């Protein structure tokens, strides 16, 4: 049952991202329960992302060494148990929660690095490509379901610990289902990797695309981590009051916007390719620029009303998510086949490091600094978070400029890549 195995793999990816973003779903409850400032709230996700980073290449190497299904199932069980423990950590110990988040990041990196290898090993046809596509679509749905499930469980059970308690049972069930259905598939060096690296750094468009993807990761992390709290605080500032509904709406919009952005980016790049060879990078920039504007407008709109802010979420999320499907094409066309795997690994590492790894903690630090320098009140908390988020669209614009430079150098570095292949 290879098709059923890949179906369970997609479900496991959905649950992986669900568990990843559950904490962001119940961000406010965690912060109020532990009495921790915004800095720790961002530090949770920062530690998670750093663990994901330091785990992805090691888990890839391990998969290259040992079987993939065993590692993946062990990981599912591992992070399921870690989250279940996270739901029981004492209130007085917050470092325990941070450590549990780090371990969950390790496990989820193991899954994210092992699953595509399993999918590729199972089949090597259009059906296998479709399985890879369904596994990829599990990501935005996973995040949206994470925010929705966290908010719904926290509101229904009257305790945010239940939002974390629900997921591990599904994790264990999905791990057993994976271990049973997935069939086992079978399919110096450091110096060679260093040569490949040096070659990559010699490339201009690859470096520019890596920096722009890092900016995209920064924006995505910071926003996905701080926007539900921002919506709750905006509602608090306004006379109208419900912050669980806002997180639910944000999750639904995030899922729908991920789908819409992927499809529209694919269509737009398809059209623009016929006009000019540099279309694939250019498109990205354009989108992000638009997104940047909207990503800023929301904040102002967030002070006026929440519905306009949600429309801004829709448009900006679509524009920002349009970039992922095209970044892979840019990387594939820029780098030669031999150095493509190393290029992908290095790009992922750089995108998580320069961006996502330090974005949430930076937003929290800026918000806390603005709060401390000023009078303390819910409105000033809202304003501090708004400024910290407003920092992001500037990074999005910088990433758009990086994509523009990638567009400029795409033809010349594509010409350099093909000449090397021929020789």
């Amino acid at each position, epitope marked *: 049952g290879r098709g059923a195995a890949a179906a369970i793999l997609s479900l496991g990816n959905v649950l992986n991202y669900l568990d990843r973003y559950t904490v962001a779903g119940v961000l406010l409850d965690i912060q109020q329960h532990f009495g921790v400032k915004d800095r720790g709230a961002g530090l949770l996700q920062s530690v998670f992302i750093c663990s994901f980073m330091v785990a992805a290449p090691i888990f890839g190497y391990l998969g290259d060494r040992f079987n993939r299904k065993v590692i993946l199932s062990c990981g599912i069980f591992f992070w399921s148990a870690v989250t279940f423990s996270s739901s029981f950590i004492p209130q007085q110990y917050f470092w325990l929660l941070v450590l549990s988040r780090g371990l969950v990041g390790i496990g989820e990196a193991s899954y994210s690095t092992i699953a595509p290898t399993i999918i590729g090993d199972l089949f090597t046809k259009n059906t296998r490509t479709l399985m890879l596509s369904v596994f990829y679509f599990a990501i935005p749905l996973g995040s949206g379901l994470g925010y929705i499930t966290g908010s719904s469980v926290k509101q229904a059970a009257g305790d945010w610990h239940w939002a974390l308690r629900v997921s591990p049972v599904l994790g264990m069930i999905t791990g057993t289902l994976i271990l049973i259905l997935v069939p086992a598939t079978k399919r110096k060096a450091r110096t060679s990797w260093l040569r490949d690296m040096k070659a990559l750094i010699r490339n201009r468009s690859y470096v520019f695309s890596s920096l722009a993807t890092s900016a995209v990761s920064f924006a995505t992390g910071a926003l996905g981590m701080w926007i539900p709290l921002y919506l709750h605080r905006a509602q608090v500032v306004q006379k109208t009051a419900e912050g669980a509904k806002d997180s639910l709406i944000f999750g639904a919009i995030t899922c729908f916007t991920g789908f819409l952005g992927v499809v529209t980016g694919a269509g737009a790049t398809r059209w623009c390719r016929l006009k000019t060879q540099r279309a694939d990078p250019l498109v990205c920039a354009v989108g992000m620029l638009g997104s940047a504007i909207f990503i800023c407008l929301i904040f102002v709109a967030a002070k006026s009303s929440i519905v306009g802010a949600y429309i801004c979420i829709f448009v900006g999320e679509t524009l920002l998510f349009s970039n992922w499907a095209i970044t892979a094409d840019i990387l594939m066309y820029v780098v030669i086949p031999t150095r493509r795997a190393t290029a992908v690994a290095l790009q992922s590492f750089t995108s998580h490091l320069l961006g996502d790894a330090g974005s949430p903690y930076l937003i929290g630090f800026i918000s806390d600094l603005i709060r401390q320098s000023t009078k303390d009140s819910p409105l000033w908390e809202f304003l501090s978070l708004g400024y910290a988020l407003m920092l992001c669209p500037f990074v999005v614009v910088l990433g758009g400029m990086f994509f523009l430079a990638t567009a400029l150098f795409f*033809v010349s570095d594509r010409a350099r890549a093909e000449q090397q292949v021929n020789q």
Partner: nanobody, 127 residues
Framework: QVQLVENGGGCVKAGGSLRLSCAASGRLLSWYDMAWFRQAPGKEREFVAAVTSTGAGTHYVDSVKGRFTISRVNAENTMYLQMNSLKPEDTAVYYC?????????????????????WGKGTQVMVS
């Protein structure tokens, strides 16, 4: 979705110069790798030359190396093969082939089966 039109092929004396031009207008030519394949009257089509979609890398078969030069202009969406020091063995129908851009070595792509596009071709003769 590309149409290939070959022109410039005719009778030329031994040792003369002749240019064969392949034009494409269905889709932007920068997205396709191109090649010239010559078919003899009693033999199957053989590899003459190939050029990448960008025009940086060019490949020629051993028999033709040093006499024919392949150069493509993406601005005119065309590919010109200049042939010099023509010999009687060069007599054949030269067909133009275009293929979807892939990072596969041209020397490996001499099976005349990877090119998904083809044209009627322009005949050439020597003395």
């Amino acid at each position: 979705q590309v149409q290939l039109v070959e022109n410039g092929g005719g009778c030329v004396k031994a040792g003369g110069s002749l240019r064969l031009s392949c034009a494409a207008s269905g889709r932007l030519l920068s997205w396709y790798d191109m090649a010239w394949f010559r078919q003899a009257p009693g033999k199957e089509r053989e590899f003459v030359a190939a050029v990448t979609s960008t025009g940086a890398g060019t490949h020629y078969v051993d028999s033709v190396k040093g006499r024919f030069t392949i150069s493509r202009v993406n601005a005119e969406n065309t590919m010109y093969l200049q042939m010099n020091s023509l010999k009687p063995e060069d007599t054949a129908v030269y067909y133009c082939a275009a293929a979807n851009t892939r990072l596969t070595a041209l020397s490996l792509r001499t099976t005349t089966g990877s090119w998904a596009y083809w044209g009627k071709g322009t005949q050439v003769m020597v003395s």
